């Protein structure tokens, strides 16, 4: 039987800790610093480039504004419908959450990437223009 003295970690998982500043056969007196300046006793901040105007102040700001009232959709492709529902039938928003194609509690949106060959009948929000084509050309319908 396996006992508590037969358990051991996977090879490569547990590696040894580097104990620094413990003599000349390891990382010796200065512990990897070497210097006599700032880097020997302190950290240098990332924003500081020695005194010139840094990269986050030389460059202009990215143009524009963020839309506060932006609505966001969760995206499903019509080629994913063909793989998830190879028998066709009715496809709702609840049917896509259980199949893992889409997140919960969010407005869905069918896009038209892929090849739909099944006869599905899908209710969603805001169909794409090339997704309304492939659903009816496969034999089904698409309502809001």
């Amino acid at each position: 039987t396996l006992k508590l003295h037969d358990l051991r970690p996977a090879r490569g998982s547990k590696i040894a800790r580097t104990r620094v500043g413990r003599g000349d056969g390891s990382k010796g007196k200065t512990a990897g610093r070497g210097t006599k300046g700032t880097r020997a006793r302190k950290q240098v901040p990332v924003t500081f480039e020695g005194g010139q105007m840094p990269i986050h102040m030389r460059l202009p700001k990215l143009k524009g504004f963020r839309n506060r009232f932006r609505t966001e959709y969760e995206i499903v492709n019509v080629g994913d419908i063909n793989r998830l529902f190879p028998q066709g039938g009715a496809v709702g928003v609840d049917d896509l959450v259980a199949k893992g194609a889409v997140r919960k509690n969010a407005l869905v949106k069918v896009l038209g990437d892929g090849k739909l060959t099944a006869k599905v009948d899908v209710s969603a929000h805001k169909f794409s223009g090339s997704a309304r084509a492939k659903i009816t050309a496969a034999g089904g319908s698409a309502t809001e």
């Binding site: 039987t1 396996l2 508590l4 358990l7 051991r8 970690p9 996977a10 998982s13």
Partner: protein
């Protein structure tokens, strides 16, 4: 795969079929070493503590002037190079519990119980003492008819109190509830002895 149920002072009445998705699982040793480590890490208390130089009593003033004395400059009497000063990077109260995921915890428990079932180390009984008052003498003799081994995990239901009291101070016997099975107490044990009500409650909680 099939465990016959024995009775205190008697013979085999029935049998239990162990489901193979729960008692015939291939044992992952790298997985069990992580779960057993994480339980003994959560078992710690971590009540170890020292004082730093700001927490040792006194030590506010500069003990003498910096220049002109021929002594080394010191700044405080509770610096770590002094006798009685603060500890540098000493112990502070820690918690060592880890965040082992649920699927990894349940798979190590099945892998340890599968290794005992594969070796004939699972035993099913109906109850420990056949009456209502406890007796360590009658309950010790019945476990000796099962095992000759030093470590025994008795898994019996929480409502059964006369059985639990009967095997408390037996050395090398550990008691726990069926919903508290874990990898450390099963790998420490040589023989897992279920009750017939306790084994049916473990299987029904995992289908």
């Amino acid at each position: 795969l099939k465990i016959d149920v024995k009775t205190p002072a008697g013979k085999v009445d029935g049998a239990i079929e162990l489901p193979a998705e729960l008692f015939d699982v291939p044992a992952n040793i790298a997985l069990m070493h992580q779960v057993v480590t994480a339980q003994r890490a959560a078992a710690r208390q971590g009540t170890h503590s020292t004082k730093t130089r700001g927490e040792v009593s006194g030590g506010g003033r500069k003990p003498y002037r910096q220049k002109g004395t021929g002594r080394a400059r010191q700044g405080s009497t509770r610096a770590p190079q002094f006798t009685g000063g603060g500890v540098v990077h000493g112990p502070k109260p820690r918690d060592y519990s880890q965040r082992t995921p649920k699927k990894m915890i349940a798979a190590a428990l099945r892998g340890a119980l599968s290794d005992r079932a594969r070796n004939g180390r699972i035993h099913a009984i109906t109850e420990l003492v056949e009456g209502q008052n406890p007796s360590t003498k009658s309950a010790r003799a019945f476990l000796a008819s099962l095992t000759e081994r030093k470590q025994v995990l008795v898994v019996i239901g929480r409502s059964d109190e006369a059985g639990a009291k009967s095997v408390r101070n037996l050395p090398g016997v550990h008691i726990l509830a069926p919903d508290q099975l874990n990898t450390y107490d099963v790998l420490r044990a040589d023989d897992v002895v279920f009750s017939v009500e306790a084994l049916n409650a473990y299987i029904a909680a995992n289908t």
